[model samples]
Target chain A: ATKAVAVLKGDGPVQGIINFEQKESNGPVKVWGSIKGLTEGLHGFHVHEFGDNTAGCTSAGPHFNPLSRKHGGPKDEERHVGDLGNVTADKDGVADVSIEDSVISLSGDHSIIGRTLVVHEKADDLGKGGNEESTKTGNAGSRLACGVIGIAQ
Target chain B: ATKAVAVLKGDGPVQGIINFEQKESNGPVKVWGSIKGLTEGLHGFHVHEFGDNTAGCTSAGPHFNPLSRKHGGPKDEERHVGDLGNVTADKDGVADVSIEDSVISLSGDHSIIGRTLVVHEKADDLGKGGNEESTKTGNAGSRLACGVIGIAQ
Candidate 1:
């Protein structure tokens, strides 16, 4: 896996891009982003199953759970392939964040290409909350924005 | 306010720098960074009162609340000056981020130079969660890393 990107073009000042880079197929992907205009708190983030946002995030579907596991934290043994977790914001509503992960790949069976990355309205409890929705969605609240992941040159 | 910077030097792979760029004093500041080695979730981020991390993030003290207000989110009408909010991560534990903040000035009453930036272990609920620590710390858990905010000449 070498390179991939996602451009989040949304309404208002709610737009940005994420670049995922990996040195090898199994190495950790370096996720880079400059998302802005959030509510100054934790917002859920993950890769949804589809690239179709024709009806907004509603059409993006659920987490890309090809392995068919319950919603869990990033490092949980049982988690969706798209479960990248959350991104936080500042008082100025800026979520300039950096993250590295091995579960998501640029190539291989779990490649994020053509999928959609979604940012939610609130925090992801990471399945430790022991709630019905916790195991299903980590109770990560509503979708704020979604963008299709693409191959970068 | 064209340039300024903060280098977060920590043990292990827990290190990065934040560049604060502003075109004017009252304008929004563009915050850029690439922090790594996190737990794949939302992490609390703020400017602590002191640059003296001589003992660790503990010695960095509380948020740089020069106005002496309670803890709140970045967009709150009443909150600490240091309350910039949180930073997100990926499953690989990297936080490469970009932010635009107006409350943090480069030169003025709320200038962040000589202060410190800290990353917490969990989410900052932005005082909307209504916990005892919500109004104080947002119950953002422990400190993961800290760094001195400096002028970048």
Candidate 2:
């Protein structure tokens, strides 16, 4: 599918936006984006359902896992399809995240072309280490903010 | 105007959500929601316009500051109308947050009913006690992730 990206600056406490477009590659709709001006650390990030931007950005549903599975890590052999990976913000509190997925398509069935990106306050263990849910993405927990990825204008 | 309280949790990284009644204090019209899992540290938060759920979560436009003013801290006296302060996620990576604002309705003209919640990778200095953008809240940066607040079904 064609490549596209959007930017959302932290207005005060939170900020973000979404992009939508048609696919071309038909391989794995690649999603690439960046979040800068943040502290130095790792932050949780994912694609959720719904686009209703209300209540200060809390209407988006759980992770964008169309397969109907439990929340897990990104690299988990068995995890949510939306689980691309995590974003590590440098000491300056800035993180540039990008992921190319196969399960998440850009068009046709099971397409992430229309989904939401929810950034949590924790990180995903990638189903490697951490709690019992480690295999389930360490069960990071709680969504701090969110954003939707769509095709560029 | 109905009273709606926004709730913030220190659960993991920084998870937060805003609960409010719909229909301008009448029967609930919309229950917005969002989650920012796995975040770096202290990040900024706020409400934005457009319910764009496209592209995982990027369609959500800028903060709902109709005034179109310069960016400032949440508590900044001269801050943007969308500034809502900053939310700090502990080392463990968790921030549970909640709030209710009468000034910003949930489902009406002033209704933040259909907006987006964003989490920044940085922190809001709140003007940093300087003449720069009202240093009441820290100067959070970057648009790490975002979720559109929609009506609860």
- Native-to-model Cα distance after best TM-score fit, residue B126 in candidate 2, in Å: 46
Model 2: DockQ against the native? 0.06
DockQ of each: 0.01, 0.06
Put down candidate 1 lDDT per residue, B20-118, tens digits, no spaces. Answer: 888988898888887888889887888877554435566667778878888898889777888878788989988876878878776677867546678
The sequence of per-residue lDDT tens digits that candidate 2 reaches over residues A3-106 is 43433432354344333333564675655555655446776666665533344346556566667776566655566776766777777665766565666665
lDDT for position B125 in model 1: 88
lDDT of 1 by residue, A1-153 (tens): 376666565545666667788988879998888778778888888988755544556766788887999998888989988888888888988888788988888665686755678887899998878878998888888777766564443
Worst 10 residues of 2 chain B by lDDT: B3-12
Model 2 has an lDDT value of: 0.52
Question: What does chain B score (TM) in every candidate?
Answer: 0.92, 0.62
Off by over 4 Å in 2: A1-25, A129-137, B1-153
Native contacts retained, all candidates in order:
0.00, 0.09
**TM-scores for every predicted model:** 0.49, 0.45
Clashes of each: 17, 121
Residue range B1-153, candidate 2, lDDT tens digits: 232333332323445565555454535333244445646466677665554444433455666665556566644455655566676566556665544333445433444533456666677665554654333223555555654443333
